[PDB]
Ligand SMILES: NC(=O)c1ccc[n+]([C@@H]2O[C@H](COP(=O)([O-])OP(=O)(O)OC[C@H]3O[C@@H](n4cnc5c(N)ncnc54)[C@H](OP(=O)(O)O)[C@@H]3O)[C@@H](O)[C@H]2O)c1
């Protein structure tokens with residue numbers, strides 16, 4: 001299908017372009033899900049402390065390492081620094097908790113999960129007496145410096161960002177004394193949110209983009225009937241049919257052909273395997289342009305609770 005399995009990051013390491021997502025994967029199902037994924041070829045798992053299932057993901061990884069199904073060097077494990085840990089003095093510990101839960105001695109990639117810092121505490125979303133998120137007075141540049149320290153301590157091989165708009169990416173690239181550039185910006189991306197501007201900006205700077213919610217996150221907690229549905233879009237099912245593939249496989253192959261990394265989530269063994277079988281076919285330039293034409297700037301993850309946060313990323317056009 002003219003498609004290599006990994007691409008090169010600006011830290012000199014290779015990253016598998018297909019990973020398994022784990023947001024919403026129940027703790028009692030995600031261990032099996034990750035084991036099946038590794039068994040059927042996945043080498044990249046996308047994690048986060050905020051998903052509350054890193055321990056169980058770690059059990060799967062550790063078992064597959066112990067069983068010698070895979071070597072640590074062959075895995076690319078990603079996690080993310082949650083918003084309540086943006087303070088310089090909290091970053092190492094947040095990373096170490098993730099490392100401990102995942103049962104790893106390093107991460108291949110650690111991302112700032114959102115540009116928005118929240119007040120530290122037990123609550124992932126600390127709210128005031130009226131429901132707004134309570135910000136922390138941290139800024140993305142000092143948070144970035146804390147991330148750079150993790151590289152210099154051997155805890156992570158690469159650092160990156162997630163849900164940064166192009167001006168926020170630019171702020172980091174123009175940071176005084178910048179030591180390591182972001183390797184990756186992980187953003188939402190699918191035919192209803194195509195992200196041409198932000199993707200072009202990032203790629204022009206050598207920053208690799210990871211596409212999240214590539215299937216439209218049909219299991220998002222806040223879904224409503226009136227929402228558009230990628231998996232049920234007859235226009236996309238048509239393209240799938242033409243290629244004798246599933247709609248999901250087309251949705252996964254789509255970002256791959258844009259030089260994106262993509263991380264579909266499933267806890268269903270049959271879908272986990274199906275979703276990986278996307279290196280055997282090619283979307284035409286016409287297919288690609290047609291899928292792109294479905295853009296409607298529609299967001300699964302809009303972080304509506306934080307629209308007043310100074311660093312809220314989605315006021316800007318891109
Ligand atoms: N950085 C961020 O802020 C951020 C935000 C969102 C997501 N992410 C990452 O990206 C990952 C993927 O995004 P997502 O979880 O939002 O949604 P997604 O991968 O677009 O969709 C997941 C849903 O699609 C279903 N599905 C998977 N394969 C299917 C198939 N072949 N046919 C039909 N349905 C299928 C899954 O069902 P089953 O599981 O029941 O099979 C699940 O309900 C997340 O898990 C997370 O790792 C990151």
Ligand SMILES: CC1=C(CC(=O)O)c2cc(F)ccc2/C1=C\c1ccc(S(C)(=O)=O)cc1
Pocket residue numbers: 023048050051052125300301302303304305
């Ligand atoms: C976009 C989004 C995601 C995906 C991601 O960040 O990976 C997520 C993952 C989680 F585990 C938990 C929450 C969220 C969330 C938004 C969100 C914001 C606020 C609230 S509230 C204020 O009602 O407590 C609930 C959800």
